[PDB]
From a paper:
The DNA binding domain forms an immunoglobulin-like fold and contacts DNA via an unusual insertion of an α-helix into the minor groove. All T-box proteins recognize a common consensus sequence named the T-box binding element (AGGTGTGAAA) with family member-specific variations found in the preferences for repeats, orientations (inverted or tandem), and spacing of such repeats.
For X-ray fragment screening in the absence of DNA, we used a shorter construct (amino acids 41–211) lacking the C-terminal helix that inserts into the DNA minor groove, which was observed to be flexible in our early DNA-free crystallization efforts. WT and G177D DNA-free crystals were obtained in different conditions with different crystal forms although both generally diffracted to around 1.6 Å. The structures of WT and G177D brachyury in the absence of DNA are almost identical to their counterparts bound to DNA (R.M.S.D. 0.36 and 0.37, respectively), including the significant differences observed around the G177D variant despite different crystal packing interactions, thus validating that these differences are not crystallographic artifacts.
Residue numbers in the entry: 41 to 211
Write the structure that this text describes.
């Protein structure tokens, strides 16, 4: 009944084919592509919050060497579990289902300096994950959804010149 589908999945797959990269900065940088999902099967009458976090994908970091990503060493200690609350939260099921849910404003940083940003470790791979939480639920039920097409490596600068070009092209 509940269905959460990735929007613009073909576009994410073009980046994933190259190995996607997302820039992190001291002040925080918005993602491109933007993560957007369509939702059906919630109770239109109920209220829900939408949350976003980033799950580390490997037990090692990465390095771009001779035009290829390769295992690049031991990981750094895990980033703190930062969660991003979608600014429309809390809202009716009808609100979330009437048009795609877009996380256009989240910013990724390599420095914990508030502002509701997500701290990531450079040269580590992450996968976005969305959680739906129902308001007023004594069971505190939450549903979690992963998006394999949206995996990316966090970078202080683009390594792959094809990614640099792709980002300029489709944006
Ligand atoms: C009265 N009634 C019982 C079923 C009657 N047919 C409901 O409230 C209801 C009705 C229709 C659809 C859903 N949708 C469910 C689907 C999962 N979910 C949910 C998702 C994320 C977090 C917490 C969650 F509880 C919902 O709220 C609920």
């Amino acid at each position: 009944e509940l269905r959460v589908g990735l929007e613009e999945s073909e576009l994410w797959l073009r980046f994933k084919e190259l190995t996607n990269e997302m820039i992190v900065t001291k002040n925080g940088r918005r993602m491109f592509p933007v993560l957007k999902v369509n939702v059906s099967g919630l109770d239109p009458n109920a209220m829900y919050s939408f949350l976003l976090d980033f799950v580390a994908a490997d037990n090692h970091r990465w390095k771009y060497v001779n035009g290829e990503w390769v295992p690049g060493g031991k990981p750094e200690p895990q980033a703190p579990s930062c969660v991003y609350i979608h600014p429309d939260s809390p809202n009716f099921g009808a609100h979330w289902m009437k048009a795609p849910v877009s996380f256009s404003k989240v910013k990724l940083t390599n420095k914990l300096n508030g502002g509701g940003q997500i701290m990531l470790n450079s040269l580590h791979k992450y996968e976005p994950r969305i959680h739906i939480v129902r308001v007023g639920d004594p069971q505190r039920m939450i549903t979690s959804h992963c998006f394999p097409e949206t995996q990316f490596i966090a970078v202080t600068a683009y390594q792959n010149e094809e990614i640099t070009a792709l980002k300029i092209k489709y944006n």
